């Protein structure tokens, strides 16, 4: 403002923020157990055993 005495003044501020976050987690587990046992009382020592 000025009146004919002058007084001067001026201000201008600017602020800005930019935040970011990201997370990723992946798990994969597999377990398999297979057992096959055959008891044969056929009567063959070697050939029956095979």
């Amino acid at each position: 403002y000025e009146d004919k005495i002058n007084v001067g003044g001026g201000l201008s501020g600017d602020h800005c923020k930019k935040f970011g976050g990201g997370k990723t987690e992946r798990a994969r587990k597999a377990m398999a157990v297979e057992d096959i046992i055959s008891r044969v009382r056929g009567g063959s020592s070697g050939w029956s055993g095979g």
């Binding site: 001067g8 020592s45 070697g46 055993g49």
Partner: protein, 49 residues
């Protein structure tokens, strides 16, 4: 007459990255065989030495 001027500018950029991984494997396969021929039964009492 007088003129006052002033300016300002500032940027602070941050970046973070993190990773993790793990792998495991186990196996315990086995096999067995029994080829029998014959069986005997030793007498318990009244036996010679």
């Amino acid at each position: 007459k007088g003129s006052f001027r002033f300016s300002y500018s500032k940027n602070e950029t941050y970046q973070l990255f993190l990773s993790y991984s793990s792998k495991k494997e186990k196996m315990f396969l086995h096999v067995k065989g029994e080829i029998h021929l014959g069986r005997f039964v030793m007498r318990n009492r009244d036996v010679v030495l």
